[PDB]
Amino acid sequence: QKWKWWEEERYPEGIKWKFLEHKGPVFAPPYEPLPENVKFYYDGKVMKLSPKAEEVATFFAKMLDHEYTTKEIFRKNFFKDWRKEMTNEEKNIITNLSKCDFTQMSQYFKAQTEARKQMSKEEKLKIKEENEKLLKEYGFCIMDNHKERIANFKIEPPGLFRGRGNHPKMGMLKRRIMPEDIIINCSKDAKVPSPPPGHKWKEVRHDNKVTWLVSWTENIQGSIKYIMLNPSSRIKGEKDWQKYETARRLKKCVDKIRNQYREDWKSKEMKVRQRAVALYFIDKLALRAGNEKEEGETADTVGCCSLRVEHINLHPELDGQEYVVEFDFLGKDSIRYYNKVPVEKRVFKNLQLFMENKQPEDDLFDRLNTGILNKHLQDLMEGLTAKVFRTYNASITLQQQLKELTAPDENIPAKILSYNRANRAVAILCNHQRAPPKTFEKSMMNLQTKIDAKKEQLADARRDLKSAKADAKVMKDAKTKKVVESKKKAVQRLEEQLMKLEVQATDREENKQIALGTSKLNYLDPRITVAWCKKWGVPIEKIYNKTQREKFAWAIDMADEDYEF
DNA sequence: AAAAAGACTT
DNA sequence: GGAAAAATTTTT
DNA sequence: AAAAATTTTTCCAAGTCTTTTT
Ligand SMILES: CC[C@@](O)(C(=O)O)c1cc2n(c(=O)c1CO)Cc1cc3c(CN(C)C)c(O)ccc3nc1-2
Ligand SMILES: [Hg+2]
């Protein structure tokens, strides 16, 4: 079939859909109690735990290998939640987590993991088929005239929360989501999904102002989780396409905005100076619009508008550079942002004023928040917000770098290296850093041995040609000449193979501490990539895999070699 | 407002 | 998403 | 065949911006 929704008339404002029907979520299988021979110990004595308490105990047992289970916060949160799950008799015996012995439970689960990787082809194939039919039955939904895939129709099973970074709620229990916690959304004329027998949905609504199918409240942060359509859908795709179109409009007025905030660094009002400086950071350094967050509820991370005095250090001179600002702080996902950046004199002077009479814990930009900044951006350009700058700067950088680095004569592998370097420049800018691949980085040794093996074949082929040429001199004829030809060809193929391996070796090295995934899927206008591929004859499958090819179908079909962001 | 909530994005 | 699993594939 | 290196799914959150409450 293949529906090209991008050729349809743009979907109106307000209403998200007219018709919506789906089968609801897929609940995680019920908890299976431990077999008789897997004992739990408390104070050195065997103790049978009721299903509810035993289940929570298995979560802790499966995480016994991780260092975070030794953490104070983790253990405090865990035991407090585990206690709520216990019967009154169990609560009287188990006064603390340290007297407990989860060793046998831990070994059992490891044994099941070994047993599973030893299953027969009959078992394995059968499990795969049950999944496929579950995908056909619950993985799709009908939205206005078309059938579309649902992203995460299977609700995540219960477990223990860990989060990212130093989270205050790690160790807490993510309780099992039940039909009773589920809010279903569908059209008034669709067939309403039936909850499992003996249960009822929390609510059944018909809200065509939203795009979700199922929603529920998660107990850790108290936020609402959703089941929405997949990236290849029209509702997600159209919104992504609009995001890039917004970034393009920003392109034709960014210099106007830059000239304005540069002047604003001189304004009589402090609020205006701070807003102008913040804008400068978001634009030049692509920092995020740090929305304030509740203290003690989330890991301590910050963005632009939430920077504290302690997050920057001013240096009149550093490394022979003038007016250097030293940024050091934890951003999203607790990823450390460290950068020494030379700034304009007026910005440096402004920052010194913003740090006057303040404590290290106080905000750098008092009198400033994301709401005020975005309100201003909305004045400059309709639909402009803080994050649009990240999309714009990432996209313009990719386009520009692809234009400057691609060599017309290079073979596909070399062009891919160029594409990857351009993507890498975007990643470094967005600070999408990564830690060296868990000792598995030594797989560089494997490539090195392969390159050395190839260098040996190439050297062998050189001696063949060297002796073929020598034999061509003595008794010069067209028969020996064709041998010199066939030897040269063999040297050529080997040189290309070597070149390809060396390029792959360089690609991996330069990409040791960088994560390309996020920019690739969220910050780069796919049309830029599509245009580049078509222009140089690089098969799109070399850049985008199957799932990515589905998400960006709109760009792949609607974008020629002459597309310009 | 300005927190609190909800609904998207990354 | 991106590190860890798991499924495959390649080396030996 | 059996260990080793890859390619491919499986697991699990945190921000931004808009919309309602208080
Ligand atoms: C790791 C980078 C990033 O945090 C980011 O901000 O750059 C992220 C994370 C996650 N996703 C992304 O697209 C991206 C990149 O843009 C999707 C995603 C889904 C996750 C789900 C699945 N949900 C949505 C059902 C979890 O349950 C828990 C953690 C998850 N983390 C992520
Ligand atoms: Hg960026």
Helix (H), strand (E), coil (C) string for A87-118? CHHHHHHCCCCCCEECHHHHHHHHHHHHHHCC
Task: From the CA of A227, give the closest atom in ligand 1.
Answer: 25
Q: How far from each other are the two terminal CA atoms of chain A, in whole angstroms?
A: 30
Decide: A333 in ligand 1 pocket, CB within 6 A. yes
| Helix (H) / strand (E) containing A66 | none
Contact (CB, 8 A) for A419 and A401: no
User: What span, in angstroms and rounded, lies between the C-alpha atoms of A147 and A22?
Assistant: 10
Nearest by Cα to A78 from A175, A176, A174, A171: A171
DSSP letter, residue A557: H
The residue whose two tokens read 């060297």 is A466
Residue with tokens 């997949």: A230
Q: What is the b/e burial string over A120-153, where b = at least 16 CB atoms within 10 angstroms of the residue's CB?
A: eeeeeeeeeeeeeeeeeebbbbbbeeeebebeeb
CA of A332 to C1' of C6 (A): 29
As a whole number of angstroms, the distance between CA A272 and CA A241 comes to 33
DSSP SS3 for A325:
strand
> CA A441, CA A512: separation in Å to the nearest integer?
8
Question: For residues A289 and A303, what is the distance between their CA atoms, to the nearest angstrom?
Answer: 5
Q: Does any strand D atom come closer than 7 Å to the Cβ of A299?
A: yes
Tell me the CA–centroid distance for residue A211 and ligand 1, in Å: 19
Give the span between the Cα atoms of A223 and A156, in whole angstroms.
15
- 3-state secondary structure at position A140: strand
Q: Give the span between the Cα atoms of A150 and A67, in whole angstroms.
A: 36
Q: Judge whether A149 and A229 are in contact, CB under 8 Å.
A: yes
- Residue for token digits 């303040």? A358
CA(A492)–C1'(C4) in Å?
41
Decide if A305 contacts A172 (C-beta within 8 A): no
Q: What SS3 state is found at A494?
A: helix
CB of A371 nearer than 7 A to strand D:
yes
Asked whether the beta carbons of A325 and A348 are under 8 A apart, the reply is yes
Measured distance CA(A402)–CA(A418) in Å, rounded: 7
| A180 class by beta-carbon count within 10 Å (0-12 exposed, 13-18 middle, 19+ buried) | exposed
Ligand nearest to the CA of A223: 1
Residue A58 identity (one-letter amino acid): T
Ligand 1 neighbourhood includes A332 CB (under 6 angstroms): yes
Question: To what resolution in angstroms was this structure determined?
Answer: 2.1
Name the experimental technique. X-ray
Residue A145: strand, helix, or coil: coil
Give the residue from A399, A437, A340, A377 showing the smallest Cα distance to A526.
A399
Of A307, A311, A290, give the one whose Cα is nearest residue A390. Answer: A290
Separation CA A107–CA A109 (nearest Å): 6
Largest CA distance in chain A: 102
> Mind listing the domains of chain A with CATH numbers?
1-31+120-231 (2.170.11.10), 32-119 (1.10.10.41), 232-386 (3.90.15.10), 387-565 (1.10.132.10)
Q: How far apart are CA A116 and CA A130, in angstroms?
A: 16
β-pairing, A140-143 vs A146-149, is: antiparallel
Of A212, A227, A518, the residue with max ligand 1 atoms within 8 A of its CB, to mutate for a pocket test, comes to A518
**A478: three-class secondary structure by DSSP:** helix
3-class DSSP assignment, residue A262: helix
Integer Cα distance of A179 and A58 in angstroms: 24
User: What amino acid occupies position A304?
Assistant: C
Q: Do residues A399 and A564 touch, judged by C-beta distance below 8 A?
A: yes
C-alpha triplet A279, A347, A343: angle, nearest 5°: 95
